[PDB]
Structure 1
């Protein structure tokens, strides 16, 4: 069987959001993986402030 080809070790396919398995909108790299949609929901939990 061939379910899996296409190494997927890099690029847009390997990037997966930690919150809702999203890959389309870009995902940051600060030790963190979000959507930028659900990051606004969770910044108040993970401890970012605006100032």
Structure 2
């Protein structure tokens, strides 16, 4: 069970293979440009990372 039944097929790619790099949350992630945050964490840190509201 620990290592005998699982790990017998490619399943390393699902949504559970990702999580927000700030809060380990798997919902609403941002993959674009690779900063890998959720919506809200990115909104919090956008000023610091370098994204500024101009449009």
Where do 5+ consecutive residues of structure 2 fail to align? none
Q: Return the TM-score normalized by structure 2.
A: 0.68
| Larger fraction in strand | 2
Find runs of 4+ consecutive structure 1 residues off by over 3 angstroms: 1-8
- Matched residue pairs, number? 51
| Larger fraction in helix | 2
Q: Return the TM-score normalized by structure 1.
A: 0.72
Q: Root-mean-square deviation (CA), in Å?
A: 2.3
Structure with bigger gyration radius: 2
